[PDB]
């Protein structure tokens, strides 16, 4: 299983 998180961690996820 791979890591996931809240969108603010990556620029593509939150921005």
């Amino acid at each position: 299983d791979r890591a996931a998180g809240q969108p603010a961690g990556d620029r593509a996820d939150g921005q």
Epitope: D1, R2, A3, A4, Q6, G9, G14
Partner: antibody, heavy 119, light 113 residues
């Protein structure tokens, strides 16, 4: 669950590398974030790292200042701070973004590493 | 970056009395996937921050039930029904909607005895 390295005294313009030893969980399954505590009540998010492939995501403020690496064999995460100034004297934390009921949040924190930049 | 404004910044509460902390964000924390990534954290003296609640109103299972969370898109509120002596510390709000993560200024909760 997370054990951080001891305090550091760093000369200005030098570099420091602090560690965050993980244990008791699948190391490659969770992001490892780093937080800076400059003043008494100031918290800044530095960045995160995927310990499986080393993929890193940085805060724009700490780009060219922080470098995140992991050692999968020792299940330890590292943050290197470059060209330290007095502004870098702070307490740095590592945290795990854990999983509970399909949701993700900072469920484990290290005790913090005190970094003092001085001549 | 999202600006997180906490009111008040200091708070004095007697043991057994309610306490309320507000957090206002510069933009709506409702993500496109429908989740509102607002987190409340507590930092006791000499300790690392600890998550009290995530997703506005969901408590971490270890946290006692006297803590509760509410609030919409931009305005949020952390409530303690009955303040106890162990609740002393600094309280933060944390948004996880927009990159990058941004914390609030922090609210210092002091006990009156």
């Amino acid at each position: 669950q997370l054990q951080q390295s001891g305090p550091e005294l760093v000369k200005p313009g030098a570099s420091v590398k602090i560690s965050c030893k993980a244990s008791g969980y699948s190391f490659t399954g969770y992001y490892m974030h780093w937080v800076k505590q400059s003043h008494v009540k100031s918290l800044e998010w530095i960045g995160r790292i995927d310990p499986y492939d080393g993929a890193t995501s940085y805060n724009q403020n700490f780009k060219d200042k922080a470098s995140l690496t992991v050692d999968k064999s020792s299940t330890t995460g590292f943050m290197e701070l470059h060209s330290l100034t007095s502004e870098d004297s702070a307490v740095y934390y590592c945290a795990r973004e854990g999983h509970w009921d399909g949701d993700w949040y900072f469920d484990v924190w290290g005790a913090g590493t005190t970094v003092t930049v001085s001549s | 970056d999202i600006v997180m404004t906490q009111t008040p910044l200091s708070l004095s509460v007697t043991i057994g009395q309610p306490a309320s902390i507000s957090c206002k964000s510069s933009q709506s924390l409702l993500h496109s996937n429908g989740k509102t990534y607002l987190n409340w954290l507590q930092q006791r003296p000499g300790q690392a921050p600890k998550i009290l609640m995530y997703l506005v109103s969901k408590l971490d299972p270890g946290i006692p039930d006297r803590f509760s969370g509410s609030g919409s898109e931009t305005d949020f509120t952390l409530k303690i029904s009955r303040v106890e002596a162990e609740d002393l510390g600094v309280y933060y709000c944390l948004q996880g909607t927009y990159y990058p993560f941004t914390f609030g200024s922090g609210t210092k909760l002091e006990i009156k005895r």
